[PDB]
Symmetry: C3
Subunit: 490 residues, 3 copies
């Protein structure tokens, strides 16, 4: 006649690691790391990304005429720029503060294009010949649709020209202009005239006065001339004045815009945009998951889990899985099934397995709480950003990089280390819970049963089902069987 | 006759959390997080902050004439700017590198104002008409007290003008100038003259050369003109040369300054400045605490505890409070209750109580020790063309805050669970030390107590406590009773 | 007749700390922190650093004529600038974007100097009088070897001058120029001429047009004039055009360069450069170690361990050393001491000793594995107008340092306590395996040993060790006693 203390086992082959031991098979586990993504770009909070097609952010916003598919009012949750986009700044030159412009654009929600300065604002000049082979449209010469390249009428001098616009709305306005620099004085004379020339732009809060910076330079996109492109934001209430007597690339169309209530982004990617929705949209695809870590990409919008370098974060929730009557010391019981820890008895009324409800449940609750506590404490994300840096910003670019890789290494370490350490605790907690049941039984039976050093106890007497249950509920009664016992123990 | 092993309990209702379970009542705990502050600004290392009143940092340092209350020599542990301050850059324009100037000013300790270039320096020009309705003083037109707005005499051309100053002291000098930009060529001709005009400033180590950038603009503060304001530091030994034939807003008064040996700050706040002292002064008030974390503010000067987002960090120092436990023990944490013919009573086990007290006190102090650093967020400012480094700074500051908060919260949960396991084990040890000694001269009861099969006097009971029991002496008397 | 359960001890005096107690002596420990360095500069991936001697990075790269020891093709894994170097920008003025130039230079691995614009490119001007007392060479007046200071011939006007160069290679080219600003109109007229003057430089991707900004300024290095120095990179394929009628300090020699596949650095240090190799080279010396943390310096190139502020990170790998414990055990960590009529002796329990050795070894390696990453501080420079990003960089670097230090110190304290608890438990297990087997055929003694109520031969004692004891066989003989 006997009773054993033992623990659950099953067919699982899932392994976890601990600080002490690797490749340890367990009965139950939860993987905390999401590794799967849909390789595409989806809507976020029901708002679609803007596909720039064969255009760059600059070609788009300056209105390169090969970018007409994007022309006009648009709204977007994020921007998708194709890596090999060919249509950008077609007439050669520099966009001043280009990287800050992109940051601005990435924080914008919606834009509304409108005519800020119609051609009629500039009088005594040629508003219809401002085109170049560098900016083609259907093979012929053309120009940015948001800028107007004014030149003199052949017969007349380039008169002083003036224009004003007042932002009377509540939305800020993003607008552009340029100064054209011919490669020599002959072209300068032809297009604008000799003498001092200036482009002046004035606001309540910005002031601008510049002239041609003539110089012979090698051709870029077929052109020896250049344009310095500038951008600015006319704030609500502000008024802009424009004066020039030459070399002005005037603002034509501009954008009333709103600033997103959400984090946005410009993704440089070739992934397709499809008709789908995503809670979490990363640079390298959409994630749909309840998990709390993620090794897909550090760059995203929406609500994503923390990025880490890990290939897995398998957290043990069950016991060491070790199958082979006999109790816990020789392994686990595939036959238990009921629960995690329990008993196996054998008397004249048969035999069988039964879990200890109370200790199984107390352990389930502690583990469930542990998991939720981990989920809770990992419920923040460091958010890397794809801002851009010029060739003269190596230092802050490197600063940003070291910072982003810094937090990635700390969080990866934190996550990996936590899983290793708590797994060891989880498995020790099992060993102890089993020990507790075994010891609750041992203390009760004293010398009315033999230990066997094995997890089971052999009764020195008869133990019916009502006796065996009296051991489970912890109300055994040593004296009743003490005499019967001692006679067989001697 | 009997002896029991048990543990302490009391009237405490304080709860802590562990990784395994929540809302666990304990006998003793220490709260590690400071959440209280005095909503005011105090002295730090016995030096008072500077209240800028109705002035902004810029109005102050350029000497806006409505800011005369701040004019002259000053010194401070930190600066308090009022959010709604109205007197700043009164004549419209831009202070170049304004944000870097503020960082500088925040690292300054004391300033001494002095006349760098008196009016007599500039000859053949009008040094007495340089005033505007935009910078008013008692209703009349005026101008910044640290700058001089020079224009031509009506009859004469604006002559080339020159001035030099040499810093012969050991203190650096902070000084200001500007270039005035009229809105059109007519005003330009009136005030300075036509042709190329320049403002040139030179030093052993810096140079500067700029002209008017004339342009039609809308009025701001009633004026279509603008001034680009500039600042710089003339180092000890250096000499400054100034040369212009127009558009120069010349330096007039400047500041010899010293750099603080301590971290300083500019707080934008409406909190009152009072006659008090603070070891730790945050943007949102003063903290006086021995605690090691703090959820008041990430921005401070003085010696503050680490900022975290947590609402509490309650660390268990005692046992699970379950009255189970013995409210009657009082002596210590773990111990005994005996009963014989000489009475009964409770008594703690000194040695195991003390060993556990020392381990916990060490744990607390070890935590305090390892958390004895602070990440220090700074209130530097960023222009509208510095969105990227501004965002970089923000993500960094929040980055450390999230790692330290996680570190702190997680540590408390994990070590609380260890603390409470250690109690369970210590109690079990005493019980087992007793059991092994008595063997079958006493009955277990499965209950924590032992019923003696014999008489056990106080001398016997004490022999069990000190671990020198003597089974054979009572073995006969014992075995017969069963 | 008896058997005891006990644990190892030895002569070790090494101490570790735990979260619960301090100065705890243990039998074995591993120090995880490297504190030793060779105070010198070594080769890294077989390439030597470049010693700038008495020259600054700027004097070197502009070709200050007192820096001829460096002149020409060079290559390096890192640059060592001496703190007290005196030869830099000798004619007074400002190198634009100097700090970015240094970052560039730190990322370069080899340069090849060549004549970009020979003197013959500039016609109708004086290409042979461009010298100053501020830039001396053997006592006489001279000038940077990579720049040409052109002035007018006395009799003639300064003609418009032109030059072009096209980068037809695959390597980028680093080059320099300047604009000279005289201190007054008389010197201006003398050297270049009156009227508007300009210096124009053009490329497919950069445009430059500036004039003299004449002003009297106090003398620096004996000179009231100034030069604004500029630098740029002509990319492969690009072509540079130069046009001026005055005030041009022309490019003369420039550098084709290659970009390092590795992190480089400019170290400001007086440490000697020697014939050695270093896997890890820090600003304050070379480290050769297998350890995983390091308190030598946060600045390095090569493969270094993680920098921390700690003075030590001693991890317990053995037991509490308390000779209590058995100096006589030697075999292993946990075991037995028996005594019968066939003698006495000590013997370790192989299975439980080995399981503990493996768990600890794994713990150490796991720690090593998880700490196998480094935050890398950099010595980029910041101007006096970059206090904010300089402070941002500083707070960031000290931020990670504090987090990693905390992580490392805290981990050692916590795992040391776990390590020492695991020993206490393993010993207790052996003791309780033996107790359950013997029941009342032996006496506990409350002491760790068991006194047998019967005779226990070596075969009996081993039957206890292997866990197959046989209580009934000796139960009668026992009960008699
Ligand atoms: C995130 O981790 C997963 C695995 O946990 C990586 O995906 C595996 O990569 C291997 C080796 O290339 C493939 O053969 C397996 O098919 C992948 N496993 C799964 C489940 O997809 C993945 O590369 C990691 N992500 C990133 C961006 O590095
Ligand atoms: C713990 O107690 C608080 C009240 O202090 C209560 O709001 C909360 O719901 C409790 N949590 C759990 C898990 O019982
Ligand atoms: C922590 O401080 C916050 C400040 O954000 C305060 O409102 C709150 O009451 C604090 N939490 C607790 C539990 O004191
Ligand atoms: C142990 O602690 C004391 C101070 O409490 C210290 O003086 C002593 O040097 C320490 N020993 C070691 C080996 O660090
Ligand atoms: C590193 O720690 C060691 C002690 O292990 C000490 O001798 C040394 O001062 C430390 N080095 C530095 C640079 O702080």
């Amino acid at each position: 006649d006997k009773i054993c203390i033992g623990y659950h086992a099953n067919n699982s082959t899932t392994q976890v690691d601990t600080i002490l031991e690797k490749n340890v098979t367990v009965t139950h586990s939860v993987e905390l790391l999401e590794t799967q993504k849909e390789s595409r770009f989806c809507r976020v909070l029901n708002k679609a990304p803007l596909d720039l097609g064969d255009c760059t952010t600059e070609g788009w916003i300056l209105g390169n005429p090969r970018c007409d598919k994007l022309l006009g009012d648009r709204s977007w949750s994020y921007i998708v720029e194709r890596p090999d986009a060919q249509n950008g700044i077609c007439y050669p030159g520099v966009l001043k503060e280009a990287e800050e412009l992109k940051a601005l654009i990435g924080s914008i929600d919606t834009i509304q294009r409108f005519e800020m300065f119609p051609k009629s604002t500039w009088t005594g000049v040629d508003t219809n010949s401002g085109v170049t082979s560098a900016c083609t449209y259907n093979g012929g010469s053309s120009f940015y649709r948001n800028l107007l390249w004014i030149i003199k009428i052949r017969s007349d001098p380039y008169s002083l020209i003036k224009g004003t616009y007042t932002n009377t709305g509540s939305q800020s306005i993003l607008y552009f202009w340029g100064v054209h620099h011919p490669p020599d004085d002959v072209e300068q004379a032809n297009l604008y005239g000799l003498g001092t020339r200036y482009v002046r732009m004035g606001t309540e809060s910005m002031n601008f006065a510049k002239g041609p910076e003539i110089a012979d330079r090698p051709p870029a996109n077929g052109q020896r001339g250049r344009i310095d492109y500038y951008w600015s934001v006319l704030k609500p209430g502000e008024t802009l004045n424009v004066e020039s007597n030459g070399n002005l690339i005037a603002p034509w169309y501009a954008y009333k815009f709103t600033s997103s209530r959400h984090k946005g982004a410009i993704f440089r990617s070739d992934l397709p945009i499809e008709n789908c929705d995503a809670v979490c949209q990363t640079l390298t695809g959409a994630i749909n998951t309840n998990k709390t870590f993620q090794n897909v990409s550090p760059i995203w919008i929406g609500e994503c889990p923390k990025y880490v370098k890990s290939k897995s974060l398998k957290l043990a929730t069950g016991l060491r899985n070790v199958p082979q009557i006999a109790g816990f010391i020789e392994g686990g019981w595939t036959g238990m099934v009921d629960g995690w820890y329990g008993y196996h008895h054998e008397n004249s009324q048969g035999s069988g397995y039964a879990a200890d409800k109370e200790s199984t449940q107390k352990a389930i609750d502690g583990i469930t709480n542990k998991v939720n506590s981990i989920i809770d404490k990992m419920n923040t994300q460091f958010e890397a950003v794809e801002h851009e840096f010029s060739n003269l910003e190596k230092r802050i670019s490197n600063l940003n990089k070291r910072m982003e890789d810094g937090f990635l290494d700390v969080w990866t370490y934190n996550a990996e280390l936590l899983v290793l350490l708590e797994n060891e605790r989880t498995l020790d907690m099992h060993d102890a819970n089993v020990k507790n049941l075994h010891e609750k039984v041992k203390s009760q039976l004293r010398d009315n049963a033999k230990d066997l050093g094995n997890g089971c106890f052999e009764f020195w007497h008869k133990c019916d089902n009502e006796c065996i249950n009296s051991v489970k509920n912890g109300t055994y009664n040593y004296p009743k069987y003490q005499e019967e016992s001692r006679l067989n123990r001697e």
